[PDB]
Enzyme design. Sequence first.
Site, short mmCIF file in Angstrom:
data_model
loop_
_atom_site.label_atom_id
_atom_site.label_comp_id
_atom_site.label_asym_id
_atom_site.label_seq_id
_atom_site.Cartn_x
_atom_site.Cartn_y
_atom_site.Cartn_z
CG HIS A 1 2.38 5.45 -3.36
ND1 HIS A 1 2.53 6.71 -2.85
CD2 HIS A 1 1.20 5.45 -4.15
CE1 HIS A 1 1.53 7.42 -3.16
NE2 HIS A 1 0.95 6.90 -4.01
CG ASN B 1 -0.63 11.37 -2.79
OD1 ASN B 1 -0.20 10.24 -2.19
ND2 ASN B 1 -1.23 11.36 -3.95
CG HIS C 1 -8.04 -0.05 2.06
ND1 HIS C 1 -7.86 -0.31 0.72
CD2 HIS C 1 -9.24 -0.05 2.42
CE1 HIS C 1 -9.09 -0.19 0.31
NE2 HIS C 1 -9.80 -0.28 1.47
C1 HEM Z 1 -6.54 10.46 -4.35
C2 HEM Z 1 -5.40 10.25 -4.18
C3 HEM Z 1 -4.66 8.87 -4.00
C4 HEM Z 1 -3.87 8.87 -2.90
C5 HEM Z 1 -3.62 9.98 -1.75
C6 HEM Z 1 -3.54 7.81 -2.44
C7 HEM Z 1 -2.42 7.55 -1.55
C8 HEM Z 1 -1.74 6.47 -1.52
C9 HEM Z 1 -0.57 6.06 -0.77
C10 HEM Z 1 0.19 7.06 0.00
C11 HEM Z 1 -0.24 4.77 -0.99
C12 HEM Z 1 0.77 4.24 -0.20
C13 HEM Z 1 0.19 3.40 1.10
C14 HEM Z 1 1.39 2.32 1.60
O1 HEM Z 1 2.52 3.01 1.98
O2 HEM Z 1 1.01 1.08 1.69
C15 HEM Z 1 -1.05 4.17 -2.06
C16 HEM Z 1 -0.80 2.96 -2.28
C17 HEM Z 1 -1.72 2.27 -3.31
N1 HEM Z 1 -2.96 3.07 -3.96
FE1 HEM Z 1 -3.18 4.83 -3.71
N2 HEM Z 1 -3.70 6.87 -3.64
C18 HEM Z 1 -4.51 7.82 -4.45
C19 HEM Z 1 -5.31 7.25 -5.32
C20 HEM Z 1 -5.58 5.76 -5.83
C21 HEM Z 1 -6.37 5.19 -6.72
C22 HEM Z 1 -7.52 5.85 -7.41
C23 HEM Z 1 -6.15 3.91 -6.63
C24 HEM Z 1 -7.04 2.87 -7.35
C25 HEM Z 1 -8.03 2.46 -6.87
C26 HEM Z 1 -4.99 3.53 -5.65
C27 HEM Z 1 -4.46 2.67 -5.40
C28 HEM Z 1 -3.35 2.22 -4.66
C29 HEM Z 1 -3.07 0.82 -4.64
C30 HEM Z 1 -3.43 -0.40 -5.25
C31 HEM Z 1 -1.86 0.84 -3.81
C32 HEM Z 1 -0.91 0.26 -3.10
C33 HEM Z 1 -1.46 -1.04 -2.92
C34 HEM Z 1 -1.08 -1.37 -1.35
O3 HEM Z 1 -0.98 -0.50 -0.20
O4 HEM Z 1 -0.75 -2.43 -1.19
N3 HEM Z 1 -4.70 4.86 -5.17
N4 HEM Z 1 -1.61 5.08 -2.40
#
Ligand code: HEM
Lengths: 722, 726
Positions: free
Chosen positions: B101, B174, B365
């Site tokens: 993202h 999402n 988060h």
């Molecule tokens: C169920 C589905 C998932 C959704 C809806 C989801 C949704 C999102 C969204 C919208 C962002 C962007 C947030 C932002 O703008 O900072 C994001 C960032 C991220 N997601 Fe997820 N995610 C999902 C699953 C996962 C999984 C399994 C992981 C690993 C555990 C993961 C790890 C991350 C990481 C490491 C980032 C960027 C880290 C950060 O915010 O700095 N996501 N995710």
Amino acid sequence: SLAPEDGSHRPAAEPTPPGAQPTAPGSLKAPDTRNEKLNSLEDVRKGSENYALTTNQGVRIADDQNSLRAGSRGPTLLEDFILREKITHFDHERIPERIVHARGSAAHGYFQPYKSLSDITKADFLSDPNKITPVFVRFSTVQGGAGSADTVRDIRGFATKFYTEEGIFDLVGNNTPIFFIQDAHKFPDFVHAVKPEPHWAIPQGQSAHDTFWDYVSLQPETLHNVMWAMSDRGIPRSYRTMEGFGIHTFRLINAEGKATFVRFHWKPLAGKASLVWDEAQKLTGRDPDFHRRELWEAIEAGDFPEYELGFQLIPEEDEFKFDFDLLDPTKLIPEELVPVQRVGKMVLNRNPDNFFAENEQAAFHPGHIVPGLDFTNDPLLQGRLFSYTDTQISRLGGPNFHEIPINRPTCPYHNFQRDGMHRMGIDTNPANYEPNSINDNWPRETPPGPKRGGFESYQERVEGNKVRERSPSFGEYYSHPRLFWLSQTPFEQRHIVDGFSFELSKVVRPYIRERVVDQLAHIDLTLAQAVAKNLGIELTDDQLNITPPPDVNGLKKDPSLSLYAIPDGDVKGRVVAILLNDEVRSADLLAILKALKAKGVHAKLLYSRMGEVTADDGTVLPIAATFAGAPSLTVDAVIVPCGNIADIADNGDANYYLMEAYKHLKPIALAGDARKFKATIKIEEGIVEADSADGSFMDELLTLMAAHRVWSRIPKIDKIPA
Amino acid sequence: SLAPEDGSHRPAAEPTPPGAQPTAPGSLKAPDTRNEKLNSLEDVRKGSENYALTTNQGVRIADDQNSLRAGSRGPTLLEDFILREKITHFDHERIPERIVHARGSAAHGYFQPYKSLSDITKADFLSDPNKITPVFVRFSTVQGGAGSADTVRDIRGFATKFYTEEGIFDLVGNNTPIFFIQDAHKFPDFVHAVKPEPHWAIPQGQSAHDTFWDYVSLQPETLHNVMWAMSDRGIPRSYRTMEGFGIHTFRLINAEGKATFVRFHWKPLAGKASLVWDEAQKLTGRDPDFHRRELWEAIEAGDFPEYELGFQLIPEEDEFKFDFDLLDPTKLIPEELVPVQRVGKMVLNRNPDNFFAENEQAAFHPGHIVPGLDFTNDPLLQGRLFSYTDTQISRLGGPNFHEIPINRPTCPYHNFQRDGMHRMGIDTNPANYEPNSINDNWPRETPPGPKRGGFESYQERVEGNKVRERSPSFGEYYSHPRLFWLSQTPFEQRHIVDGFSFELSKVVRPYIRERVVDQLAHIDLTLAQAVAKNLGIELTDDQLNITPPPDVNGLKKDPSLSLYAIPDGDVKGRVVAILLNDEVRSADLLAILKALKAKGVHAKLLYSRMGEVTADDGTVLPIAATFAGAPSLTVDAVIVPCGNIADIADNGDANYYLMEAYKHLKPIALAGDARKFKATIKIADQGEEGIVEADSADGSFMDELLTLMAAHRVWSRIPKIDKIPA
Ligand code: HEM
Ligand code: HEM
């Protein structure tokens, strides 16, 4: 086993044309391609076949599909160290991208001089024609992020890391012979102006926005490089078909201590070639990785990018003999005044294994010189010397970035520097200072000398007051833009006018457009009037009466500044789309492919679906891509063989394929009934046609390909709806 | 003074349509738009007007054009601290982008519930309809870098930071109701498979490559979200015209301690709308910042993105009453079985001031919950809880990322945590531990309670052995892809077939294509056969005889899964290209612009050059962009008024403008002599549905055009577009 029984998962470890096999890490594709640096990286290469999957601590993993939980539908447990290590590594993968030149593509190769240059430089890598120096080269854009597109309109970087026997020498250049600004103090201002605007972070990979043109309008020193960027120089066809330049005047130092001024050049042995703007912009959408892909695939095919290193040499006593200042990086040295002397050849013959480890982590810096070279007081170069070491501290996480494998010298390195984040080297020296007696003062200083000596700066005379002042000799901004303009062909001039017109049409504040048009009136009135007309601006009587700038040392043009005035075309490595039908005339196809093979031109067989088609003689033809999947943007020329033309005659994608290729000035060849396509593309220039494809037909097509594009087609292309 | 005397360098601090004025920082464009969070950021906002240029130490700079040198042609001196500070700051501007993202666009806004939900949750922000919660929302793609394009085919992120009186709640969702994988342990595998391949770092913002389809072919759990990505859901028209989902089943906890299972939804009040693939791919080239731009400009125009928060609620006793596992994130809850209950409204009404400071540095988060909410054992959610805190340590350089202004709670925060890189807070507490007597144990723990209580986890029963085992209840992969497929209109189905066909055509290794086609045969044979035909693959007799998967609790379809089956079109905020000529019929233009304005539809006046043209009555018409500069890709419909049509009749760009818009199913309206353009798009004299035509741009003409615009695209034209060479 998950691999197919037929072994079709694995690419052939031999040269293959683009699209013939999946691409692969360099040491798997070309295992027998070697050089001293590639061999020295063997200590850190990691394989995979027949190994067990482990944690980073070497513990074998039994189930890499599941977290540890209290019950199969239960909560994940904190004691799952395997999950946490895997996720932790993933979570911390990214490092900061480069401030500028974040988007880049790299390859391994070697350099060799044609003759000893011992008379003008004591640089070891230029001392003997039998002396081979491994290189790592990174080509790049400037503005865009690491995730931005390749075929943007921008300046291109051309950085070469020479792993010399006397130290790393980094030749950090661009694809134009000058820069936008004069003094390094303005670099953050310029870069901030061209980069996405601060409030909303728009636009990506584009200088077509208010802040850029605001800065340009207020800083006329920028106009020379702006002219190059607005020309087709700003949209190269390939990194293999662009020039390279060090920009700054540097020094060569010989064994006797004589200094010679030098400007560095890279001549593409594949010739100079650029896209056209509409093609380039549409290619950023259809294939944002076009240049990266083309480079990788050329190397995999054995079409190795080759460049000739050249020097413009100026004796010390000739420092003041030009109309411009040698130390001014907004000024070029016309080849008509100082020729480029051929020095040696560089061949890029292997791709990396891991893009992140080798390309992303590579650190180039113009301050990385060797004995036999030196700097000048060029005030842009002077500031660059500070910046590169500095930026690498945060980008690469510490002062030990030279220990990252790609950056490591192949020659010895020993000193009293210690510690720092991610320290790899374990120093056994009882001393970490000098002078010392406890280790008999080792490692020791080395006096300067003819070979294998220590670095000593050239004892340049310094006289003056401590001033933050621009030399009055730098205060001329229009003569080099005019020289450049007058050296361009009429079609190249049109493309410059169109470049400025398109860019300024995206500037919201009209006064900025007006101010840029005023700057253009100081360069050439034809240029200014043509751009003004496209913007609905009328030049004032004062603007119409601006005296054109002076000639550059009596030159009213230098053809070496044009991409196309002097043909230097080479077809090897170019690609042709062949538009198939469901009953291809096999005789046409045999003749086509045979002729292309003989000249090292690649072909991609296209159709309306994937799979295979059968020719008139039962030959099964495998399809590489669809008409929509591999548009004309990605090829150099189009051939339509005869057969069942009715199968594709009414196919919108096939018709558009030819209209786009036509618009973009590409050679088109139509055999037999394929000539029916002439009408659908509204028709002319550079259309090869005959009853069948043969010697004559293919010779004509290949002659057009050597000329790159059909410039004669330009006058009426505006009218074509494509 | 370098600014023009007429003040045309400065945008009007009032709502203006896209392209009317330069875009600007939010607090300068809309100074009167306020909320508690925006107001709390005032302490860190920095102005510029009337201030002297200084070093970061406050020293005034006299010459910001030159380095300090020994002579005007001399070497730069190490004592130039001004140059080194400026270059140092520049050299260190970049931070790591988000692993996933990385490409995203954000805005400030507010949320308000419709009624108190005290009966089902003790969450303070849902307790009172008059309780306004500021929000910061970031929309994103998944795969691409921060410099990648907006209109790629991908899943979109929809992250909302709620600044509640009882803590920050981040709803990190999402634009699809499921994810690709079941267990967080596989996230690096999936992401590495979709991301650019490791040897060469190709392709950017695209799943159309070997490793992605290799993983999909070997992991059938991915097929449901793959179906959504291959559909037009993967290419939204705008962040304003997509749905949002939390994906996971979470819990609501009320004051009595009752748990209710919940799945979160965002309903776009502007309706659901997507691009068509050719348009989306070309838009990545012509305007890679299309979505970011559209969002910013909609807010500047007063077209505020609005979303309705909704909940699917399932009682605790109903946990096992479905054919799928509630804890399985690859499964959706059909709205036909569990309706979405309206909860409240979110309005995005102000852009940031500085993209880096506010958007790039924002940290969302899903583990950031508040009392009244809780987690479930969903094994994807479980692993997410670890990841977000972890990644923020390197991305944002330390454990004090909550001190970065955009991330700061608006409610009190006090604890015994100290130090860490770039520590802003200066703690005066004599104690940095608890229990303590030296500060009478302050700050103190708070028992859980109905309002303003401490956080306590719901006492869920745990029974089982410590296992790395997938629940057998998760081992069904085809029923939900089939339910989705059958819920689509025939044109949406064609677009899915085309999505798979295009993507698999880019897979070099043919066996991977064959393996994916085999997976499709387990979902629907019509789908599989259509994709196979496009790939020159023949299904085997065994493949032709695969038994279709079961219905989902007796449902064969659910129309809530289609973008278009149930009309929900809204024209406000859409844009129309008006193709000018050098002598426009002013009567046509007056009628056109007035009708568009009344419905909140924007217009862009296009010509073959910039500047102005004069209408038949002397009205000076300013040109917004050229036909090449603002292609049809960027608009929703095209109108060609009458006048001197001969001026543009032979213009290749004007003709192509119409051909492109036609292929992309956009409404086209031609007045008077502009009907001569019907030949370019092969329209018969008798006309065609989706082409508005008349002698003038009268009452009926604009109403017909606006009716077509409310339907988004002219789906009935699909059989006709194949013949057009565009
Ligand atoms: C169920 C589905 C998932 C959704 C809806 C989801 C949704 C999102 C969204 C919208 C962002 C962007 C947030 C932002 O703008 O900072 C994001 C960032 C991220 N997601 Fe997820 N995610 C999902 C699953 C996962 C999984 C399994 C992981 C690993 C555990 C993961 C790890 C991350 C990481 C490491 C980032 C960027 C880290 C950060 O915010 O700095 N996501 N995710
Ligand atoms: C002749 C003018 C210039 C040229 C040809 C040039 C060229 C380049 C190229 C090609 C790269 C990327 C190399 C790579 O890592 O693959 C680069 C990086 C960079 N340049 Fe320059 N540059 C110029 C001037 C400047 C100036 C004046 C500054 C600052 C004073 C500057 C600061 C930097 C920094 C900080 C980076 C990133 C270095 C890194 O992170 O590896 N450059 N430049």
